[PDB]
Each structure stands twice: as C-alpha cells, then as structure tokens.
Amino acid sequence: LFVALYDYQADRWTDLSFHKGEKFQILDASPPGDWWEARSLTTGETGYIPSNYVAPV
C-alpha cells in the first residue's frame, strides 16, 4: 500500500492526479512500464501512476 511524496497532475486521462501524502491501493502492477494501476485512498479513484513517484508505508 503506497503513499505520495510529491503533488502530481497527470497528462493522460488514464492516469490519476494526486497530492503529497495521498495514499494508494495498487491494482495491476504486472504490466511492463514505469506505471502501476492504483486506487486513490483519498478520492477512491482508479488509474495509472508513476512508480518512482509513490512510496509504501
């Protein structure tokens, strides 16, 4: 279960925007790519996010 260390406004409508301290339930980490499918604990939203961007508790 992952947290945000910086604020982020995504470019693709497939990805989430989020703020510092936001937290995420990852969903599909299998596909090859910087990005994992996660679920905002803060907004309840699903979408891809940068894996160098979040941090696990």
Binding site: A10, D11, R12, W13, T14, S17, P31, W35, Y48
Partner: protein
C-alpha cells in the same frame, strides 16, 4: 463521448458495455464474434461483466444481455508508459443470441490513412467535468496527420491512430475506452487514451496492426 449526440437506440448493436472490478470500473468494447468482445488492455480486471443490447445503461431493457467474461486475452506487448498495444480480447462465458439490438461486427476475410472521417460510440463522459453518459452517445471524428499526436508520449503511427480535429471539441473521452472507431462501417481503432483536458486528438489503437494476434486467438479458442 464529448460533443456527440445520443444514438438511435440499438442502432449500434455491437456496442459492448464493460463492468470491471479489481473497486469497480467501466469501459466500452465491441462484439466481433458471438463469444468475443474486443476492448483495450487498460480495462483488464479481476472480473468483468458485459452488458449488450443497451442504449440507456441505467434502464434495464429486455434487449439486454449480461455475460460473464470467463477469459481475458491482454496483449502481451502491452506497456503502461507508452500505452502501446492497448488491445485486449475477451471470451464470453456464453455465445450471445443474435437479435436486432445485439449483433456482431465482423472483420473482412489495409493500413488506413489520415483524411477520412470516422465514428466512435460510448457511455463515457460528455465533458471533462461531467459524469458518464446514461445513454450511448456517438460522434464523427477525422483521421489526422500523426504529427498532430506528436506530443503524445511515444506516438507510433504504425500502432496508433490520431483521431479528432484539434479545431473542434468533438472527441472521445474517459470511459469511452475500448470502444470501436468505425471507419465507413469498419472497425479500425479502439479508443485508448488522450489528454486530461480533453483536447483532441486522442490516441486510438490501430486495429490493422494487431489483426494477426487477433486471428490467432479466435482460432486457437
């Protein structure tokens, strides 16, 4: 569908509606075989319900056919940085019954150029800050010089289509994903992704490219 009009109901009998859970999420798709739905790979999920025969997605009609997807064929090349190979096949638990409101969209027994018009349909949002559309919407878009998608993250004119005039509002948006881009009545692209601010064009998967991966699946199954 951003900037379209509600369809004539069941006029698009191929339109599949996908209900995906890991939470829930919703996409479009279309029916290519009596037991196969064509969609996008970023829709994949723990389990998926598939509604066919719908116009209003919230009003239970008798044309409806909800079927459990019992297999997921995510393209193996699918990559989440470029969103290349955003295509996926779904084997339905049951062969659907072909009626008026529910029909397959066959593929001919050809690389498509910029220039032509096309149409895509979906229950996605009808605007950046709006909800998904209750009713199926559609819109006619134009195929663009891929230098129009140039600033898209690794845009490849061989894997992807660049759909929608930038000088208009008309565009496919969130939730419309997985829905077919029908060029002169032939599916040529699947809605993949686009800008967050809903500025066109949006990136569609180039069907022609993955047609063999497709042929292979439907044959071996």
């Amino acid at each position: 569908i951003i900037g379209g009009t509600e369809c004539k109901p069941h006029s698009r009998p191929y339109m599949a509606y996908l209900e995906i859970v890991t939470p829930s999420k919703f996409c479009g798709g279309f029916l290519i075989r009596r037991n196969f739905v064509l969609t996008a790979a970023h829709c994949a999920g723990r389990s998926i319900t598939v509604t066919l025969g719908a116009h209003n997605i919230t009003e239970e009609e008798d044309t409806w056919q909800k079927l459990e997807v019992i297999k997921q064929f995510r393209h193996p090349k699918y990559n989440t940085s470029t969103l290349h190979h955003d295509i996926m096949l779904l084997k339905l638990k049951e062969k659907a019954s072909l009626t008026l409101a529910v029909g397959t969209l066959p593929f001919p027994s050809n690389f498509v150029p910029p220039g032509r018009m096309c149409r895509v349909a979906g229950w996605g949002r009808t605007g950046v800050l709006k909800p998904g559309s209750d009713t199926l919407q559609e819109v006619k878009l134009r195929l663009m010089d891929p230098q129009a998608c140039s600033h898209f993250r690794d845009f490849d004119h061989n894997l992807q289509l660049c759909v929608g005039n930038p000088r208009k509002t008309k565009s496919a948006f969130k939730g419309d994903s997985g829905g077919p881009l029908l060029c002169a009545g032939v599916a040529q692209g699947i809605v993949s992704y686009g800008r967050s601010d809903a500025k066109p064009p949006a990136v569609f998967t180039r069907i022609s490219h993955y047609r063999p991966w497709i042929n292979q699946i439907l044959q071996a199954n």
